[PDB]
Amino acid sequence: QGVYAPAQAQIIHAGQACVERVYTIREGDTLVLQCLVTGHPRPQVRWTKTAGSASDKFQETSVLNETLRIEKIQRLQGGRYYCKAENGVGVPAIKSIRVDVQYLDEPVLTVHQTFYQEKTVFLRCTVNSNPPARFIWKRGAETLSHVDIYEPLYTQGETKVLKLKNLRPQDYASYTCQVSVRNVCSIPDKSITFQLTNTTAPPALKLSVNETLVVNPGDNVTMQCSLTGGDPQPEVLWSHSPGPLPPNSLVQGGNLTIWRIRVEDSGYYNCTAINNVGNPAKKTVNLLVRSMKNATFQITPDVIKESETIQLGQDLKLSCHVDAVPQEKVVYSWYKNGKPSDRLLITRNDPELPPVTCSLEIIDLRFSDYGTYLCVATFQGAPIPDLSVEVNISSETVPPTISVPKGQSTITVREGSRAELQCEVRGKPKPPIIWSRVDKETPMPSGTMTVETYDGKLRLESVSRDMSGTYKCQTARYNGFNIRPREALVQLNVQFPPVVEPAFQDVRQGMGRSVTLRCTMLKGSPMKVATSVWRFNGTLLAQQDYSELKVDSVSRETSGSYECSISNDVGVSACLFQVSAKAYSPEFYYDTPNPTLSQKQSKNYSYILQWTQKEPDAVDPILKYRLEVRQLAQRNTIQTFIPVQKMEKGLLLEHILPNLKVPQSYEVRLTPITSFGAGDMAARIIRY
Amino acid sequence: VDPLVATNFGKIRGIKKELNNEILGPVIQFLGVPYAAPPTGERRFQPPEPPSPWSDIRNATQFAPVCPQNIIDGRLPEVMLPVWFTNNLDVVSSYVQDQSEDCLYLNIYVPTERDSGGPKPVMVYIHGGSYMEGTGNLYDGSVLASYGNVIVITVNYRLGVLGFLSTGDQAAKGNYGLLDLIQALRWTSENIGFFGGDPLRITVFGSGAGGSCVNLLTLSHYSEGLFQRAIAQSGTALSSWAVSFQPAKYARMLATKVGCNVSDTVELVECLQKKPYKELVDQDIQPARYHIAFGPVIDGDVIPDDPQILMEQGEFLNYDIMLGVNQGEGLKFVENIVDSDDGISASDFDFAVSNFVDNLYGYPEGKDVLRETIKFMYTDWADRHNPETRRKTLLALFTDHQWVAPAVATADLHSNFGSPTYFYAFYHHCQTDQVPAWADAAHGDEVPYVLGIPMIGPTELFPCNFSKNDVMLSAVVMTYWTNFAKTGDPNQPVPQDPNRFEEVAWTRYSQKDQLYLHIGLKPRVKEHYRANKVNLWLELVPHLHNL
């Protein structure tokens, strides 16, 4: 390639700046970076940014523009930017620049008090700033070692501390930290002052409730957090964990009220006081709302005899459980066709089973034990309602077995629609089913690894292909037999339309020569070409995992747009080819001094129009170019023909436009002509 | 059979290779593949240009000439090179005896086969000892490729003067060797698909200065989209010998040596371009101790700024990263000061530190307190009189400073800025009769395991009598390395299948917990590798500089 030149970039500075490779500006101002580029064909330019995805100044910022513009810049918008410029010839051009937004926040001033001879106070001054700040202390007059000043570890220049080793009376004054950023980017210094007095003292709090507070749902609880010391007067603030305070909870300020408290409102409520003196005071109260949920039973046949079924002459455990907030306060009552138990039937409150689970055992099972057992969980004198779990034991009760009904082992559905997976469980009682995925360890529509279901149905509203795989269904260990869970698998096909290749392809070839088009299917379920249909300019044609078409003679009559419509049994997708013997667009040459002043008079200049032909040998040879010249101002165009002598990839072509009015601009449209006719036209604007 | 592949530059013929191992399948080798144009004539001290195409079938059955170098004990630095290299120069010499300035060639190893189907991952090995010598030809990727079912590529880039000379201005911007590596990666991205490789899963890895190269590439915008993951073994961009900070100084010393030292930097470079490459290579240019003369430079383009500044300010893309160090990197640092009793005297200890402080910490005021503080920290106060314990701690000092501290700094910053990071410590090796019996895993000792050398038994380059445990550990390392390449997770998709790594999942590294994998015959995950000594160099010592 003779004239084709690799891209070349250069960054230039604009907009508001201050004062080599870095572009420093004040926060809030406007950034303007321009990337000048050269090379042929004219390379494209995009400004991008390079930042750690997961921290601090990060934005995804890909703009296709020779000018980067950030108005009212911010701290985070800062960082390193690079301008990339490419044109196909050679290696892309890259230039780097660091934008260094600068600032100086208001300084924070805090103070801390502290053998037994001298009292010592530490005045700590902190500020966030770019560049690193400079600190100056003063007590009306500037202070030096004459007391001590220094920067501690675990600070990157953002902090200085003023140490008053011996607190003499003159020291009881107004201390002010004056922090400066060296006035770079014309940024003013800033100051903060504090009134150090012998009454100065950190905050202190008193709470109107105990360490831990238990309450019933609906109850109104109000908590008074009051100051008991602090100078300056500290600010009191309530907070909640987990999550925010509201709804139904209002902060008057100091006073915290919770109306109609719900069970989910339980947790820690912390009152904190701050006055920038010493450590902030904090009082913490843990509010526990009572509740009982998820009462469950378990049938545990003889474990030592290795049984999974109720058999006469065996031990039979009937457990009981409920989830409660004051878990230690629950009490269970076992009834059996009424409420009874010493001999043969015994109570056990805490086995290896879940926490706080009451379970009676029946030694030497007997037909007389066949009955309806009931467990009643309750709170000692609590207004909340009791909870119960009934569990009928009889000859009929039997461990469960699970299976897939008929042939729904593999069930296929189209993407988007709803899907329903099915397992059917048998036994008395029937435990709920727990669905999980096996092919991989991923979560589910519900967002967790498993879902509970009693009907043995798993419903999928908006089924996604991601869900396509293998699913496990198994019996619960609760609300039934506490036995090795029975398992069964089901396949889930999520069908979706095909995707073919290429989606679009601009095909060029001589007039007498032939060409073959292939449309290939990569993904698609079913992964089979149900049918492939080649179409030409709307009309259908005549006719394997893919489809092929051969254009015998690329002529004006056969040249056009071919469409291969590959389709599975669910949807259709098509490749689209553009066949022709059109020459490619000419490539305007932009890097030359063009205009020629006619004696600076007659209002005439001339322009040296230059360009190259992209891939001259891709089609029939270029005979002549049609040159059009319009002035923007008027519709009429001057049409001319440049005749090509011959050309090779990279040869520069030239043409002078003799009569052009000195101040106006012109549009230039340049079209190649081959035996096939007009190729792809290109356009450009020239100017004096 | 006859491996022929048509690339964008022409047809290429490969060569089938059987491995000396019944479980490993054979591989296809493409040796001496041009990935750039010869950097000769006006192309010397200039960026690489794409290679010229050919119309026939080009043979790739043998290694191409290596880049100009002089390792025949031509005053090379032993403290920077891997012990396996320096202890076997006669064999190493045979790999670089055939030289030419036209040396921009790469080698491709393709497996002949597993489980998941589709384009296979590509692992590009970047060699490097001191930037002055070496060749990818020394690293046979056959076993790694065959065992892991991945494509392995070794690259040859311009070395020393020819690859890194810089005048500090536009006359010679330097980093030519890095540009060749970038160009090699470009070639790979554009042509590896023809070999069955996945350009969307390219992992770059290297040991020593090769590891330094890997990290420097991750800080360059030129690497965008080129590769997705990086593995850096015993090498960072933050060490004292990773970058040449005074290129102009050394460029003029060379010029003076060859009669090219003129005022104009442009005329100086043109003068060098007229000189025979051998004349430039054979010159004696000694750099400051623990530093380099000719190597990567901060040009503001390839390398936008000091790696330290770029990393601290998170000015780098988020690649998947795996990095680590060996228990006893600095063997050669003390090996030369050890007495006939395998111990180090208190006076020798003081001397080493004194030399150490002066060379790395050239501060005029305060070097005294520094030397004394460093001695105290690296003194074992329990058994303080033992000359052998003194040897170990001194070795640790150099190891901690040159390898451990920089690696942790890199890992901390990468993870902190969102890059998935994995950290390891190599506490195993195979002792030859050429290394002291008291030595632990030294610099480069992990290479044979990563390359699967134990599986094909002792080689001319790696003569150690590998044990069954060496084979087992080698398999494990290769499993982890290729797993990272395949998914970005050392634990996926191949499980560790007695194998002591069966239940050992390699947790991701974070600055808060700093979990790392202890690689040895008793592997397991630990936390905060040498936290105390590492923090000394990274936090306290810098403070003693007086800001």
Ligand SMILES: *[C@@H]1O[C@H](CO)[C@@H](O[C@@H]2O[C@H](CO)[C@@H](O[C@@H]3O[C@H](CO)[C@@H](O)[C@H](O)[C@@H]3O)[C@H](O)[C@H]2NC(C)=O)[C@H](O)[C@H]1NC(C)=O
């Ligand atoms: C109602 O309460 C019962 C407990 O009585 C809950 O059943 C429990 O569910 C959890 C998770 O669903 C089970 O955790 C399991 O831990 C084992 C550890 O060996 C592990 O292998 C399992 O994969 C699972 O993570 C727990 O075992 C199970 N307890 C019993 C007794 O079955 C039930 O989920 C609660 N349901 C509702 C709606 O509140």
Ligand SMILES: *[C@@H]1O[C@H](CO)[C@@H](O)[C@H](O)[C@H]1NC(C)=O
């Ligand atoms: C580039 O961006 C500037 C402002 O950011 C705008 O004025 C101009 O029209 C844009 N031009 C192009 C070619 O993107």
Ligand SMILES: *[C@@H]1O[C@H](CO)[C@@H](O)[C@H](O)[C@H]1NC(C)=O
């Ligand atoms: C503190 O200063 C005040 C002056 O406002 C003085 O009255 C008082 O005695 C001093 N001592 C204490 C302990 O407050």
Ligand SMILES: *[C@@H]1O[C@H](CO)[C@@H](O)[C@H](O)[C@H]1NC(C)=O
């Ligand atoms: C809670 O407050 C509401 C009004 O705020 C009142 O009507 C209700 O009786 C109160 N209930 C209790 C238990 O204090």
Ligand SMILES: *[C@@H]1O[C@H](CO)[C@@H](O)[C@H](O)[C@H]1NC(C)=O
């Ligand atoms: C409240 O304090 C507890 C410990 O006392 C702590 O665990 C919790 O995070 C705190 N919550 C808030 C909002 O500060």
Ligand SMILES: *[C@@H]1O[C@H](CO)[C@@H](O)[C@H](O)[C@H]1NC(C)=O
């Ligand atoms: C507490 O504040 C609530 C509103 O936040 C108010 O309704 C209630 O009367 C207050 N009670 C006390 C004792 O301060």
Ligand SMILES: *[C@@H]1O[C@H](CO)[C@@H](O)[C@H](O)[C@H]1NC(C)=O
């Ligand atoms: C169990 O027996 C009780 C006894 O009254 C009956 O009400 C119930 O319907 C039976 N079936 C159950 C609990 O499933």
Ligand SMILES: *[C@@H]1O[C@H](CO)[C@@H](O)[C@H](O)[C@H]1NC(C)=O
């Ligand atoms: C097909 O339609 C396009 C639409 O412009 C046209 O250019 C082409 O000539 C048509 N082909 C034939 C064979 O008429």
Ligand SMILES: *[C@@H]1O[C@H](CO)[C@@H](O)[C@H](O)[C@H]1NC(C)=O
């Ligand atoms: C200037 O251009 C006009 C036509 O636009 C032409 O008639 C005239 O002769 C030209 N004069 C010169 C000096 O070129």
